[PDB]
Amino acid sequence: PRNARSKRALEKRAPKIVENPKTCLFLRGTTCSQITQDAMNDLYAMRQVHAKRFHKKNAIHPFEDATSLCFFSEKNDCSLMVFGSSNKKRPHTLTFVRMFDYKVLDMLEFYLDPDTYRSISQFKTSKIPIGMRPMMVFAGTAFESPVPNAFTMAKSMLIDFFRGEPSDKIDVEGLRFVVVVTADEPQKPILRLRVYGIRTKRSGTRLPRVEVEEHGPRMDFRLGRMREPDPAMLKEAMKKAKTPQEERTKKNISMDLLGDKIGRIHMGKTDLSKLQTRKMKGLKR
Amino acid sequence: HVEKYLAAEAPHKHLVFVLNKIDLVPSSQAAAWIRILQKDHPTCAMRASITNPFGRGSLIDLLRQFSVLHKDRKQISVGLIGYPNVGKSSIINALRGKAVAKVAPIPGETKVWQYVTLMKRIYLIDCPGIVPPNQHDTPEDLLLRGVVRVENVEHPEQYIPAVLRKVKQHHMERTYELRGWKDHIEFL
Amino acid sequence: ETKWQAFARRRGIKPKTREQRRNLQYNPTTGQWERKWGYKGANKRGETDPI
Amino acid sequence: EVPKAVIEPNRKWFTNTRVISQDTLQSFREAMAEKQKDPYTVLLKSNKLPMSLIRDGPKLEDG
Amino acid sequence: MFKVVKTGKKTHKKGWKRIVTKPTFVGPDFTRRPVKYERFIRPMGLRYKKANVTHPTLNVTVQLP
RNA sequence: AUGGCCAGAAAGUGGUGUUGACGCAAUGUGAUUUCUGCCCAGUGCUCUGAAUGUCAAAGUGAAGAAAUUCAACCAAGCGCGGGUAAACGGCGGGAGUAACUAUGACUCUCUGUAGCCAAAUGGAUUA
RNA sequence: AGACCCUGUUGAGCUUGACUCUAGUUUGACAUUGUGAAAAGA
RNA sequence: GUCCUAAGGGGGGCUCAUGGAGAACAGAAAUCUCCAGUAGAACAAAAGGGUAAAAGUCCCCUUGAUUUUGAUUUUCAGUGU
RNA sequence: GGGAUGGCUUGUGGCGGCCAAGCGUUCAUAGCGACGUCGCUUUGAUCCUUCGAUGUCGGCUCUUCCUAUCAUACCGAAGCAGAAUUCGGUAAGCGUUGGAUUGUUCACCCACUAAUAGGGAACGUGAGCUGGGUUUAGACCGUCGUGAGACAGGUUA
Ligand SMILES: Nc1nc2c(ncn2[C@@H]2O[C@H](COP(=O)(O)OP(=O)(O)OP(=O)(O)O)[C@@H](O)[C@H]2O)c(=O)[nH]1
Ligand SMILES: [Mg+2]
Ligand SMILES: [Mg+2]
């Protein structure tokens, strides 16, 4: 990296303690239907700021070989991928791919219902501002399986998708849109994705009365094939790093409210019962 | 005087009271005085003795806690201050388990400072006794506190009434097997 | 650890301070502040002198 | 040997080394008001603070 | 800057201790080194904490820590 | 006792030894009274407990016409793995657990104006 | 012509995992070293 | 063997390689003009989709060559502001 | 085997700013600047803040010198009534003392007195007598070191 700009790019791509927000690459296979492309466009519109788009046709079957997916992730620094596909067996498929260290961590297929699908443009409402993260609601009994399953991985993937940029503070004017995923434990269960805008009304109390209006897109999914993580790779990915601004707690050492370092001492209970006083001549009767 | 200097100028130094010669008082009175002094500073009860000490393990534990709190430094230094003849050198000897500092009932036995290695990271510094100057302290008060040698004072009979006031009469009668005096001159 | 880093850890060689490693020094003959290395550095002294 | 004692020109000589905001000052003033004395705690490292801007003023009779 | 402080009871004295002859500033929470490992002696009577500082623009001299 | 501790250049040499554990030899401390801060296990002390890991000379095998070279095998000690005089040394405590054995690691929180109890005394403030 | 201080291709006593050795001690091998058995390998 | 108010950063303007058609010397190749030009140039890397009112290239400003603070992270500290 | 700063010093702070008679300059109006002044360094208080020995001083016994005068003599001034003084001048002729305290920079307290002045002649190395800095060899205690030993040191002969 002789160039300072290339050095900056390398430092941006370098591993960090506090990671960058994840980037999602949107790409399609050699055959991909118009409904699948519309679904991909709606997801990209929800995630514009941290996404890149491919426009060519890629001869990739991810559950057979993902070498090209790993190459694309390493080239574009994208750790989330949305892959569109179509077939006779699978007419409308979105494959969510999550990667770790430019290798496939896990993969999940979503089968889209074409008849119930509605785009964002099919609702005449004011839409979400660009870059605004929405609130999230996950509903139903399908997301509390004791063993990790397709619905648990789908919840994790959708959280990583609609996560946005983390922040310690949020404006109260930035709570106007909610994304609701509903799925019930059971012939296959249906994972339903809906987006709503939020209106508040006076209710006579301090808390306002919430009302919702549909925003789009309307999506019905059936969970399909699954690629589970290796346990060692999963442990590596689920490790959490401590920031330097997280103090390692020392015994008996603390900080007071003025910033002074304070140490605590422990005297113990005074037990003078085992002390014999001096048998003085003036006390000996 | 020294407490005010320590509070004003060196608040980072840790002041610890040590009540010595607790074998000369009733234990209930020693506990009451400990409860009074611990409102201001942490207080350790101690009988200073090489052979038969009291409070030695507790004081060692407190110094160990201070050493752990200052584990970044190479050591902690613990300076012993107080009045003459209160038992500073005796406390150093009791903590060491060996006669390392000179001990006498003569006030002013220790004249210069002395470094004693208690453990690898703990030093003890013996100091001569100090008498903070007060305009309300009388020579009789200093003599009864033990500041001076009584061999070098003129007219020692004048301080006997203060001793007779301080000591209960039956205690003196039992000490000297003597009774029936009406004043200090006839007692002497 | 590099070879220098392992050697410095073995020999107790401390890292230099940021004031110590500054690219600046006082030349008394000219009475001026000059860089030790780099452009017009002191390591290339005399290469542009007239004589 | 007699060294050359020279200070170099530097923009760092003409800046503010330590700054503090009004919110931090107010937090420290509230802590100063609420602080209490504990015999079983010791001070190990003082915080470098502008204590003249944090400490409460003297009594009006004294002033 | 430094003067040699001599130690030992013999006629030939050890000379490793150096006393600073100029005023010094030791900073807050200062505790002196133990005497066996104290090479540089900064004596108590030469330690300063305040300075008379003049502001050139305001033409005001204040005593500052 | 086919021993310990010594001596001699060696000796079919001498001593301890006309000796045998209530003895001999080497240490440290130093009458009596007082007296063994609490707990370990890093250095050390010692365990023939399994290994060949290191592994000399001699011996064994292979090649070569031979000089020679290459291989295994390989005592004690070291190393590895156990118990300590626990001497030096280190060592703020007390609960827990998910580790499960060493090293744990991660939370919690700690402040009688002359008595009682001990085989008269409570001492070293020792004649 | 002491004592003190300074210098040495300095002398000497003393200490220690300083260097090279070494008494003592310990371990292996060859020789002194003979006569019969039983077992396992050539 | 030479030359440079260094590189870097921010902002702004502009568009390249090449081909065709034209302009005294000038003729395959010197400079100017128009048109066409997905980058086929340049600069980075080693794309299987790097960058075009720019990441290219020229102007303006900074060039101060490794700032200050931290009770926090890791390591060290017989000289622990 | 060598070796063992000085016609100095004294009574009035430093830093920053301002003013300033004057010096310079007057094709540049800058630069020096005495005398001053201004800012940083408890309503007679508090007595609950004493801030580091590498550097050594002593005492008798006795003589002389200086004056930078404490007392004695004379003189000038002050609300100096008197008395007692205070400030200053000439003056070294004549005196300037016992005593306490070594847990200690032995410096301060007490008294008498007319008064209890300050220095030099050593301390710009240095054989009168005799105590402390002080230190050959004996010995403990503390600190450091595996040790021989050394020292932050303390004690004894
Ligand atoms: N009875 C009793 N006597 C004690 C105790 N501690 C000390 N003493 C006595 O008090 C006297 C004073 O002892 P030191 O050690 O010299 O005390 P100090 O304060 O250091 O005395 P200085 O050195 O003169 O300042 C000694 O004679 C001890 O016997 C105690 O705990 N009990
Ligand atoms: Mg003492
Ligand atoms: Mg004493």
Helix/strand/coil (H/E/C) assignment for every residue in chain A: CCCHHHHHHHHHHCCCCCCCCCCEEEEEECCCCHHHHHHHHHHHHHCCCCEEEEEEEECCCCCCCCHHHHHHHHHHCCCEEEEEECCCCCCCEEEEEEEECCEEEEEEEEEECCCCCECHHHCCCCCCCCCCCCEEEEECCCCCCCCCCHHHHHHHHHHHHCCCCCCCCCCHHHCCEEEEEECCCCCCCCEEEEEEEEEEECCCCCCCEEEEEECCCEEEEEEEEEECCCHHHHHHHHCCCCCCCCCCCCCCEEECCCCCEEEECCCCCCCHHHCCCCCCCCCCC
Q: Which two tokens stand for residue A234?
A: 């999963």
Residue of A204, A231, A218, A10 whose CA lies nearest to A105: A231
Resolution in A: 2.2
Task: Give the ligand whose atoms come closest to the C-alpha of residue B129.
Answer: 1
DSSP β-ladder status, E51-55 and A103-112: unpaired
- Give the span between the Cα atoms of B96 and B60, in whole angstroms: 10
Q: What angle do CA A13, A14, A19 make, to 5 degrees?
A: 85
Q: Tell me which chain B residues have a C-beta less than 8 angstroms from the C-beta of A262.
A: none
Cβ atoms of residues A81 and A72 within 8 Å: yes
Going by C-beta distance under 8 Å and a sequence separation of 6 or more, which residues neighbour residue E9? none
Classify C11 as helix, strand or coil: helix
Helix (H) or strand (E) holding B132: none
Q: Tell me which chain C residues have a C-beta less than 8 angstroms from the C-beta of D9.
A: 33
State residue B85 phi and psi, 5-degree precision: 65, 20
Classify B103 as helix, strand or coil: coil
Q: List the nucleotides on chain I closer than 7 A to a protein CB.
A: 14-17, 39-41, 47-55, 103-104, 134-135, 141-144, 150-155
Q: Using the structure, give the distance in angstroms from the CA atom of E6 to the C1' atom of I155, rounded to a whole number.
A: 21
Classify B85 as helix, strand or coil: coil
Omega cis (within 30) before A217: yes
Classify E37 as helix, strand or coil: helix
Q: How is residue B152 annotated by DSSP?
A: G
Residue of A124, A121, A132, A209 whose CA lies nearest to A176: A132
Q: Which two tokens stand for residue B161?
A: 């009434």
Q: How far apart are the first and last CA of chain B?
A: 37
Classify C5 as helix, strand or coil: helix
Q: Can you say whether residue A24 is alpha, beta or left, with left for phi > 0 and alpha for psi between -120 and 50 degrees?
A: beta
Residue type, D6: V
Q: Is D23 on the interface with C (CB under 8 A)?
A: no
Cβ atoms of residues B2 and B13 within 8 Å: no
Experimental technique used to determine this entry: cryo-EM
**Cβ contact E57 with chain I strand, < 7 A:** no
Tokens 């010094």, located at residue? E24
**Cβ-count burial A74-95 (b if 16+ within 10 Å, e if not):** eeeebbbbbbbbbeeeeebbbb
